[PDB]
Amino acid sequence: SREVIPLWEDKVADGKAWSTHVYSALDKLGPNLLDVIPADRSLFCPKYSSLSYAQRKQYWAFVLSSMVRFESNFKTAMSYTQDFNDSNGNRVISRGLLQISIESGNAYGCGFKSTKDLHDPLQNLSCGIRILDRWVSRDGRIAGKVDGAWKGGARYWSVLRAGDKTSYKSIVSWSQNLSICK
């Protein structure tokens, strides 16, 4: 049985299927994410190095759900226009559960064929996994600004950037107080 259940199982009717998908997608798209022992585990998850593969998948599904909470409050339809342009000269639009944009997402190999695909929560979560798989494994840590540079998931998501704000403080607190982490 699972020891940790993601927050979207409490909030959305389809949350259990989101979890099922995320566990599968972590296997396939997050093999590097699941192999990292992050340098900021003492902050996010003190017992991380003791976690089994299955427990790491439960951990990451939970953390993803906390990011979704603060990026979109679990609203897959969310569409927020940013100030900057993309390669066509149109303003970037952040979409879906993790507020990813199509040009940036596709650079990670997410293969969104249409803007509508980012509003598919499963595709959106898979892309989030690809982004974490890239940066957490490259940088060897979950977040933080180290020697002038944002690292891990904080390269992409504001909610993972340390500051005196509700999103970051909640994500860190909820993570470090998971029974498997503490």
Residue numbers in the entry: 73 to 254
The authors write:
Here, we discover a family of Bdellovibrio proteins that define a new subgrouping of the lysozyme superfamily and demonstrate that they possess outright specificity for deacetylated peptidoglycan. We solve the structure of family member Bd0314 (that we named DslA), revealing adaptations to the lysozyme fold that sterically restrict the active-site cleft into only accepting polymers deacetylated at the GlcNAc positions. We determine a role for DslA in B. bacteriovorus exit from the prey cell and demonstrate that exogenously added enzyme is able to prematurely liberate predators from prey bdelloplasts before completion of the predatory lifecycle. The architecture of DslA is related to, but significantly different from, other members of the lysozyme superfamily but still fulfil the inclusion criteria for the lysozyme superfamily noted by Monzingo et al. — conservation of the β-sheet floor and helices D and F, with appropriate placement of acidic catalytic residues.
